Amino acid sequence: SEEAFIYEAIRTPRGKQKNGSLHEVKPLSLVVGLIDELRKRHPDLDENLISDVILGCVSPVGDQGGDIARAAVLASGMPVTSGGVQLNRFAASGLEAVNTAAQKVRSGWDDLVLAGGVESMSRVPMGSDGGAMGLDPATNYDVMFVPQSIGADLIATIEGFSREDVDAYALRSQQKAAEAWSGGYFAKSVVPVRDQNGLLILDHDEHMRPDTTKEGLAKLKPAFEGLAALGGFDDVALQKYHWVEKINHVHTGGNSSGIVDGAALVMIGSAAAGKLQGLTPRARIVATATSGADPVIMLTGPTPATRKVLDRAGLTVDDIDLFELNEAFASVVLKFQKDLNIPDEKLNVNGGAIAMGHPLGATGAMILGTMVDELERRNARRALITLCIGGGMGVATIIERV
Amino acid sequence: SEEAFIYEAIRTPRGKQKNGSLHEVKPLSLVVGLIDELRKRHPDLDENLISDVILGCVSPVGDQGGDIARAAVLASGMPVTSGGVQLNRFAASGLEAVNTAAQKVRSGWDDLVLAGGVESMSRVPMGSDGGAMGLDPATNYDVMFVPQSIGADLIATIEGFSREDVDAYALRSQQKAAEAWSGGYFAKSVVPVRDQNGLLILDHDEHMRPDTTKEGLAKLKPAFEGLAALGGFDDVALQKYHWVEKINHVHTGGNSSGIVDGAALVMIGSAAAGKLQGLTPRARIVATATSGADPVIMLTGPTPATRKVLDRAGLTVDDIDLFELNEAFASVVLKFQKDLNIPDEKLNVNGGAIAMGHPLGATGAMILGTMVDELERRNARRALITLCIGGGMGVATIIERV
Amino acid sequence: SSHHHHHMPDNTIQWDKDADGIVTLTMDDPSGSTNVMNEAYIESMGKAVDRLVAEKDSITGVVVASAKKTFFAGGDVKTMIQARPEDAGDVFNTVETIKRQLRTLETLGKPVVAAINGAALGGGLEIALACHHRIAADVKGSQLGLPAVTLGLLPGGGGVTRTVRMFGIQNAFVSVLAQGTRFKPAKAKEIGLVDELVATVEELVPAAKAWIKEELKANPDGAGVQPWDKKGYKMPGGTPSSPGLAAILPSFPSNLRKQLKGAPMPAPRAILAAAVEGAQVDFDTASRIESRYFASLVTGQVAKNMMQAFFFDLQAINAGGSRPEGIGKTPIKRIGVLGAGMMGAGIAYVSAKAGYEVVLKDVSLEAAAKGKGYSEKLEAKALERGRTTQERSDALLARITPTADAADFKGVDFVIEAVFENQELKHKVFGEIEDIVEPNAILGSNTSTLPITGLATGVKRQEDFIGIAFFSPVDKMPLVEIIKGEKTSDEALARVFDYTLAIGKTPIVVNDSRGFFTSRVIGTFVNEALAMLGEGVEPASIEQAGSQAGYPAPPLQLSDELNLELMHKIAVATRKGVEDAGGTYQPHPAEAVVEKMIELGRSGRLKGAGFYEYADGKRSGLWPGLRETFKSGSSQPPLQDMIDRMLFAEALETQKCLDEGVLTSTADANIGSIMGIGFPPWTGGSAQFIVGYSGPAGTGKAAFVARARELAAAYGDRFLPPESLLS
Incomplete structure (x- = not known):
């Protein structure tokens, strides 16, 4: 019934793990700083109309535990009637928070909703929340658990992707991320992280290595191969994919996503909520979808999730102008490009997670806000956002510039 | 647009902490067993139409970490296109999972969705996930953090509730829970927890003490008073409520909710999804709402949340037949009864969390499924479900029997 | 409680x-x-x-x-x-x-x-x-x-x-x-x-x-x-x-x-x-x-x-x-082993390990010393592990007497044979030694396929002739397939049966027939794999289906250890047993796949090339050209059907050995299939797999018949159940 519109979409610069600028910043402070920016952009906005604050968090433990969305509402000074909920859908937690917020608006039971995610991987490492399936032997044995790292090498081995092929994609991601920063595409979106006094801490995605060469990536070692040969996940993955003889370890540190800090926020509301608050819509959520594939490969999820959201919205691949898949692994993107025959001029046009980093809980909202600002710069119509999810899941979202 | 209907609603018996029957059962097994029961009730149901599985979990750490909803989908044999997401909104995580599932159906982007929660407090204690506001000194100091235990004593001190008054409510909760089990109101809803061989583990809410006497509750000690006097939360709470001189510690172990294990599931879908799957609707989600109040008392949330959902659905207190507030503390229910002038013949008619226990992540779905089966037994029309949430939040949901 | x-x-x-x-x-x-x-x-x-x-x-x-x-x-x-x-x-x-x-x-x-x-x-x-x-x-x-x-x-x-x-x-x-x-x-x-x-x-x-x-x-x-x-x-x-x-x-x-x-x-x-x-x-x-x-x-x-x-x-x-x-x-007072190969050397070890005086003999005093050296490199690796002492290990090596002279068997009351499978060779080798040893001596022969009935015609005391089929490696493989010939005495069975228990090994009794029981059933296993490979099945799936079924070695890998040209001769001998009897021989579809690899010069690991590719005496992955030769991937049957084909073909062939009198009981069929042919232990044996079958069709012998008929209706008439368990 009600139409969901994206009124704002901002994010923080992405730090790094080893000697990161954001290692001193609490993840709660990253969400508060973005709320402070939204007030700076709209000081005369009645925050009592904000019905909920939905955040995505994959490791809600310690600094990120205890409904950090609620901790962000109380610590930022927002009205106590704004609620707050933290959901975890692995890497797509940020995008699903946007989906859940948009679906809340269409239900008519919520007016204006903030959504996004936060993940300080330098303070809360990946997997600190334990694991219901990974640590339980009965569950790890029944459903064949093989980490996402091997699942990427298996796709490249199955689909025939060489070491030079994934290095050719990791190179253009470093370029299109450097081309995006030079052209200033992220100047309006990225909100620099400043301390209490206001002094600068980080103003740029510092995980990037824009001076990357083709010969430099080939000199790296696949750190994904020793864990597979020692842990024994190679033979486990090949027991289900029995028609594959040997796993070709093509993924290294230069062609996989980075372990970075960050947080993103997206303001979603109905047309009546934006008109009443003096807000103009920047994009419209056309359709969302949730599907999946086999959990052993763990990363073939974004392929049926995109086919579901396109057929549900009544569109095709030709009807979409921009495709944004999270660059968790290089072979994951090349797989999605081959499955749907995507022109690479429409696939991660402003770089992705290979160069700029992949904060687990917030990437879904970051690459969404990247597509909202890029649809306006290109003056295009539709954009499609997808992410590969651990557990063989997939979530896709189509937006349309207004 | 689409109307959300509750097709099924089941739950497990609630164990106990000290020598509980469910202390050996992994929380993942509690969600799987309820999925197995849903298949037993509908074997010819195409589970590929199940779009998502949303679970509420307040401490998603260890056994409950790693998107336990996804772990439940893979370990139960459900189709891999069923997704799975774990959200945390404190005690109302189970009800919000039902709300999020219902709002997903109204959006038309999801057909059939499972929702509920799970919390094995005997294996994962409360607060094991850390705390963004409780453990951070800057956050604990800025927003005045005083645990829910004192906030209940403050309401009773403010509203003038004596030790005999809260003991009079805890007694009738033990009676109406014993009257519900004797009459067999929960026979269709409660699903006994059985092991792998099928042997029984627990078939009844074992936290109950139906032989409770008025004189036995008065002999107890307020274990809520020593923590307040030693930790210093009494003076902190009185700094904001400056017009109160002394906090009357009326809450003990016999008039507060119990620390129990359990899990619940609710099957929600559109009318077209139920007709296609041969399912008949048992209730209809009329409206949901999210509001809140002051976080220092932490429990005055269910009062504005009920007023919001009633005015949004176009109803009043007189238009509702049943009220179900989670019995986290006795004074919380007496406060809600006085604020809206509720006849106690409509307030927790089948007992509540004082006798049967309060599993954090699953109570919102348990007391919802209790109201779905009670609207059919009474052949009534509307029922309203509310919960008091940590952080001064409140969530209410109105259902209508179909 | x-x-x-x-x-x-x-x-x-x-x-x-x-x-x-x-x-x-x-x-x-x-x-x-x-x-x-x-x-x-x-x-x-x-x-x-x-x-x-x-x-x-x-x-x-x-x-x-x-x-x-x-x-x-x-x-x-x-x-x-x-x-x-x-x-x-x-x-x-x-x-x-x-x-x-x-x-x-x-x-x-x-x-x-x-x-x-x-x-x-x-x-x-x-x-x-x-x-x-x-x-x-x-x-x-x-x-x-x-x-x-x-x-x-x-x-x-x-x-x-x-x-x-x-x-x-x-x-x-x-x-x-x-x-x-x-x-x-x-x-x-x-x-x-x-x-x-x-x-x-x-x-x-x-x-x-x-x-x-x-x-x-x-x-x-x-x-x-x-x-x-x-x-x-x-x-x-x-x-x-x-x-x-x-x-x-x-x-x-x-x-x-x-x-x-x-x-x-x-x-x-x-x-x-x-x-x-x-x-x-x-x-x-x-x-x-x-x-x-x-x-x-x-x-x-x-x-x-x-x-x-x-x-x-x-x-x-x-x-x-x-x-x-x-x-x-x-x-038994003195054991005589003929041949110092990988079989005859291990037999002289497990015999001497039980404290038996062994007179090892090959054609040469050179290879006879290298035959005893096989046990030397077994006691040295055991002396390094500290399981035996220097005193006992030197008494073990003191019981073996390697030699090349035939008169050194003077005083042997138990003969072991371990050379190639040539009837004229076994006839002359036994003929040189039958009049030398004690008249009461057992004339045992470690044979794979050659029937014991024909081999016994080369000696005078045919009642003392018997088959003693060991398994490589002899020091660890615990099964001994004792083949009973037509002339074989009943006392000869007990003397060898008591010897097998004395050396800590488990014996089984087999009546003389084609392929005995181990070599006969293991052939249907490797044949079902080569049948799939010719049908266009991916080779990587056949190796997974073999290991996931419970076998210790995948079939194509076993088809390289067992020489691919050696299996071609077994099909030649079987093609002779039927066409010299009048009936038209119905060849298994795997025989054409064997000759296809023989023509390509890849007849197993011994040549250095078979289905795998070998380098420096180590197995190094599958042959890349194996997919183009048989058009791999053209047929993609379920993996559970591949597992059932390699298991039923051995369970059905085991049932035939029970009817034909090749095996006397089901305990020798279950234990013999596990400790010999390598049958999966979770089945409890090839005969137990029939009555203990569990699948998506039921449980027990009744479900085995339905699944066998299901496999026969899609993969050839060879999967039909015999009458000994039909309906």
């Missing part, structure tokens, strides 16, 4: 409380010679435990001893094999009572010491694990371990719960639980399973009572309290919640599938589950989780399969089942 099973059997425990207040429980089962965990033990332990709780005032310590040769071994297998899925209640209550007795003995507040005189296997060690102190006598032949996994069960008497508490999840699983490793009393003290060692068994009890008097005086508070019952107990390696173990904990099931190769064996994964899930909770809750997993296995089909083959079938063969029904005993 008591200490007894019912709330009239014999009593199996003695009671003796000395003037110091130290009770001595001496287990002594009257009905047998082995203290076994039966219904009479549960009632005896309950009466002894209840007496300890009632007399705890006048008691200061407890010593658990035994009056048999061994301490305590196993459990009542007669009952566990009959437990149906509806009997899971009684099975759960039974093991709960057994551990409730030990938990009371364990938490008695007084030192309880175990005096381990002999073997402590299965339920035997689990009683010693319930003791606070363990003393074992260093008697050769005494074993200590939890071999419950071999029978498809888990140690459900506190073995999992206590070994994990003593050593940790990682150590206890891989070293004690998952493989059922048996330890010597010297190696047991090394890992902690035993605390003290004594020379003789008479030193046990007086040292146990001396240890209690010392423990009470030097440690009065911690006496009778296990390490995990104290306050500051920290599990070795940590619990699943500690960061050190949780980082590597996801690798535990993946490493298990790596070892088991995806075989449907539910026991090793149940042990790992009860081990980890028990470390997350307290002992008494961990003890109950261990029981629920144990009852899940006992009521299962796989456990009844392994208990049928690895217990009833093995104890029946060693009892003299297929032995001649009534024959005496005749010793």
Whole structure:
């Protein structure tokens, strides 16, 4: 019934793990700083109309535990009637928070909703929340658990992707991320992280290595191969994919996503909520979808999730102008490009997670806000956002510039 | 647009902490067993139409970490296109999972969705996930953090509730829970927890003490008073409520909710999804709402949340037949009864969390499924479900029997 | 919920409380010679435990001893094999009572010491694990371990719960639980399973009572309290919640599938589950989780399969089942082995290892020395491991007399043959030696396919001629396929049958037929794989289907060890047995695939190239050109159909050997298929796989017929079930 519109979409610069600028910043402070920016952009906005604050968090433990969305509402000074909920859908937690917020608006039971995610991987490492399936032997044995790292090498081995092929994609991601920063595409979106006094801490995605060469990536070692040969996940993955003889370890540190800090926020509301608050819509959520594939490969999820959201919205691949898949692994993107025959001029046009980093809980909202600002710069119509999810899941979202 | 209907609603018996029957059962097994029961009730149901599985979990750490909803989908044999997401909104995580599932159906982007929660407090204690506001000194100091235990004593001190008054409510909760089990109101809803061989583990809410006497509750000690006097939360709470001189510690172990294990599931879908799957609707989600109040008392949330959902659905207190507030503390229910002038013949008619226990992540779905089966037994029309949430939040949901 | 099973059997425990207040429980089962965990033990332990709780005032310590040769071994297998899925209640209550007795003995507040005189296997060690102190006598032949996994069960008497508490999840699983490793009393003290060692068994009890008097005086508070019952107990390696173990904990099931190769064996994964899930909770809750997993296995089909083959079938063969029904005993004074190849050398080793004087002979004194050197590189690698001494190992190598002269067999009463399969060769080789050795000597022949009937026509005393088919490697392969010829005496069977038991190997009796039983059935296995490869099936799937079915070696890899040109000759000999009888030979579709590789010059690993590609004597992946030769991937049948094709083709061929008299019983068919052809142990044998079949069509022999008809309606007429089990 009600139409969901994206009124704002901002994010923080992405730090790094080893000697990161954001290692001193609490993840709660990253969400508060973005709320402070939204007030700076709209000081005369009645925050009592904000019905909920939905955040995505994959490791809600310690600094990120205890409904950090609620901790962000109380610590930022927002009205106590704004609620707050933290959901975890692995890497797509940020995008699903946007989906859940948009679906809340269409239900008519919520007016204006903030959504996004936060993940300080330098303070809360990946997997600190334990694991219901990974640590339980009965569950790890029944459903064949093989980490996402091997699942990427298996796709490249199955689909025939060489070491030079994934290095050719990791190179253009470093370029299109450097081309995006030079052209200033992220100047309006990225909100620099400043301390209490206001002094600068980080103003740029510092995980990037824009001076990357083709010969430099080939000199790296696949750190994904020793864990597979020692842990024994190679033979486990090949027991289900029995028609594959040997796993070709093509993924290294230069062609996989980075372990970075960050947080993103997206303001979603109905047309009546934006008109009443003096807000103009920047994009419209056309359709969302949730599907999946086999959990052993763990990363073939974004392929049926995109086919579901396109057929549900009544569109095709030709009807979409921009495709944004999270660059968790290089072979994951090349797989999605081959499955749907995507022109690479429409696939991660402003770089992705290979160069700029992949904060687990917030990437879904970051690459969404990247597509909202890029649809306006290109003056295009539709954009499609997808992410590969651990557990063989997939979530896709189509937006349309207004 | 689409109307959300509750097709099924089941739950497990609630164990106990000290020598509980469910202390050996992994929380993942509690969600799987309820999925197995849903298949037993509908074997010819195409589970590929199940779009998502949303679970509420307040401490998603260890056994409950790693998107336990996804772990439940893979370990139960459900189709891999069923997704799975774990959200945390404190005690109302189970009800919000039902709300999020219902709002997903109204959006038309999801057909059939499972929702509920799970919390094995005997294996994962409360607060094991850390705390963004409780453990951070800057956050604990800025927003005045005083645990829910004192906030209940403050309401009773403010509203003038004596030790005999809260003991009079805890007694009738033990009676109406014993009257519900004797009459067999929960026979269709409660699903006994059985092991792998099928042997029984627990078939009844074992936290109950139906032989409770008025004189036995008065002999107890307020274990809520020593923590307040030693930790210093009494003076902190009185700094904001400056017009109160002394906090009357009326809450003990016999008039507060119990620390129990359990899990619940609710099957929600559109009318077209139920007709296609041969399912008949048992209730209809009329409206949901999210509001809140002051976080220092932490429990005055269910009062504005009920007023919001009633005015949004176009109803009043007189238009509702049943009220179900989670019995986290006795004074919380007496406060809600006085604020809206509720006849106690409509307030927790089948007992509540004082006798049967309060599993954090699953109570919102348990007391919802209790109201779905009670609207059919009474052949009534509307029922309203509310919960008091940590952080001064409140969530209410109105259902209508179909 | 008591200490007894019912709330009239014999009593199996003695009671003796000395003037110091130290009770001595001496287990002594009257009905047998082995203290076994039966219904009479549960009632005896309950009466002894209840007496300890009632007399705890006048008691200061407890010593658990035994009056048999061994301490305590196993459990009542007669009952566990009959437990149906509806009997899971009684099975759960039974093991709960057994551990409730030990938990009371364990938490008695007084030192309880175990005096381990002999073997402590299965339920035997689990009683010693319930003791606070363990003393074992260093008697050769005494074993200590939890071999419950071999029978498809888990140690459900506190073995999992206590070994994990003593050593940790990682150590206890891989070293004690998952493989059922048996330890010597010297190696047991090394890992902690035993605390003290004594020379003789008479030193046990007086040292146990001396240890209690010392423990009470030097440690009065911690006496009778296990390490995990104290306050500051920290599990070795940590619990699943500690960061050190949780980082590597996801690798535990993946490493298990790596070892088991995806075989449907539910026991090793149940042990790992009860081990980890028990470390997350307290002992008494961990003890109950261990029981629920144990009852899940006992009521299962796989456990009844392994208990049928690895217990009833093995104890029946060693009892003299297929032995001649009534024959005496005749010793062996000197063994003669012909040929110093990889077969003849290992035979001279396992014979000399049993203390038999061996006269090894090849064509040359050069190769005869290299034949004995095969056993030298087996005793040296054993001397490095410290399992034998220099004195004994030099007496073993002193019994073998390698030579090239035929007159050195003067005085041999048992001949072993181990050269190539040439009838004219075996006729002349036996002819040179038949008049030399003792007239009573057995004329044995290690033969693969050549019928013993024709080979016996080359000697004068054909009644003393028999077939003794060993398996490579001889030092480890424990099956001996004894082929019975038409002229073979009944006494010849017993003399070789008693010899096989003397060398610690398991024998089977086979009547002379085509391919005997091992080489005949293993041929249908490799044929089904080569049939699939010719049908366009991916080679990588055939290797996975072979390993996931339960075979130790995938079929294409085995098709390279077994020379591909050697199998072509077997099809030539079979094509001669039918067309010289008049009938039209119906060739298996795998024969055309064999000749396709013969024409390409890839006839197995021996040539250096077969289905795999070999380099520096090491198998190095599959041949890349194998996909273009047979158009791999053109047919993609389900993996479960591939597994059933390689399993049914061997189960159906085993059933034919039972009808044709090739095999006398099903115990030789089950054990012979496992310890010889390499049949999956989870099936319990090729004959047990028929009556114990479990699939998406049912359970038992009736479901086997429907699945065989289903495989026959899609993969050829060769899968139709015989009449011996049809309808």
